[PDB]
Amino acid sequence: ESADLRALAKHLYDSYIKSFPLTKAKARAILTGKTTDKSPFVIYDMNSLMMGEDKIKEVAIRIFQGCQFRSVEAVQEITEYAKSIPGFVNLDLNDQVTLLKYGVHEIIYTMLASLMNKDGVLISEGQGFMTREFLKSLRKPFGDFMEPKFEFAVKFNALELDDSDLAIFIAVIILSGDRPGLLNVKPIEDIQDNLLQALELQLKLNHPESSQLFAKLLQKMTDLRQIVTEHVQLLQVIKKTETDMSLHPLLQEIYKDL
Ligand SMILES: CCO[C@@H](Cc1ccc(OCCc2ccc(OS(C)(=O)=O)cc2)cc1)C(=O)O
Structure with a gap:
């Protein structure tokens, strides 16, 4: 029944809104700075950065540190969200831990695209915007760890998914089952199977013109x-x-x- 699948999609969207403070919707609205409710401060160099800690509540290491802090925070939001996926909290604890261990980072890069555009990334809850070129100019090793994310963000954002879409896709990522060390695969696959049905329908209904978007979205997982x-x-x-x-x-x- 398509109705049970819609109910599930709405449930997941709702829980997503409550789990993640900064949605793609708010993010894209900030990035398209024509909506001056609150514009971001832009960091594009050293002085920009120092003027940054000014209004925004060696350089390279500080950024590196920043990413980690944001990462740790995101793991906690994703964990909160995972708990809302029907059946997730009823699986063997060891597997709940495993699906999170392997799901967390794929999701962090997925949602990261939401705060990126070809030229930069929103930091500190949207209040700041760090350019792609500044991050790429960082010292020797710290100067190229962000590029792959941007390249992915650009191609991934072309799919034009919105938060309601992302919420189900995110759920499909967590309930994999192919993750190393899982004890009970079947219960995880039955759930993901159901999540896949909800995502397929959701894309079909929300993107009537996007041909095979479901297939294209799944490919993004590799x-x-x-x-x-x-x-x-x-x-x-x-x-x-x-x-x-x-x-x-x-x-x-x-x-x-890993
Ligand atoms: C190096 C730590 O990387 C994280 C993943 C990550 C990478 C980037 C990211 O966001 C990029 C945007 C960003 C840039 C600077 C920053 O720090 S700051 C101090 O300027 O706010 C925070 C986020 C979030 C998580 C990991 O391995 O778990």
């Missing part, structure tokens, strides 16, 4: 994996070049064996 991997090894390099520093424990525990 892109996320490569982004995660690529980022993990760039992280390994940093941990070695900077011994006086360390990756936040949560991120560290998420990366232990």
Whole structure:
């Protein structure tokens, strides 16, 4: 029944709105700065950055740190959201932990696109905008870890998905089952199967003209994996070049064996 599938889509959208403070809707509205309710401060260089901490509540390491803090925060919102997916909290605890361990970063890069445009990314809850060119000019290793995200953001944003779409797609990512170390696959697959039906319908109804958008969206998932991997090894390099520093424990525990 299409009706049960719509009920599920609305449930997921609602929970998404409540779990994530900054939606794509608000983000795109800020990025298209014609809506002057509140425009962002733009950081494009050193002085921009220092003037940044001014109104916005070495450089490279500070940014690196910032991403980690935002990351840790996002893991907590995604975790809150995951709990709202029917059946998720009823799975064996070990698997709930596993699906989160592998889902979190694919979702973080997915939602990150929502705050990006070809030239930059919204930081500090939309109050700031950091350009792509500034991030790419960062010192030796810290100067290229963001580019892959932007390239993905550009292609991914072309699908023109909105928050209601994303909310179900996000749920499909978490209830994979192909994740390494799962004890009970079937209960996870039955759920994802149902989530897939809801996402298919949702795209069909919300994007009548977008031919095979469902297929195109699913393909984007192979892109996320490569982004995660690529980022993990760039992280390994940093941990070695900077011994006086360390990756936040949560991120560290998420990366232990992947
Ligand atoms: C290096 C840490 O990377 C995170 C993933 C990540 C990457 C980028 C990201 O957001 C990019 C936009 C951004 C840029 C600077 C920033 O810091 S600041 C101090 O300027 O607010 C915060 C977010 C969020 C999570 C991980 O491995 O878990």
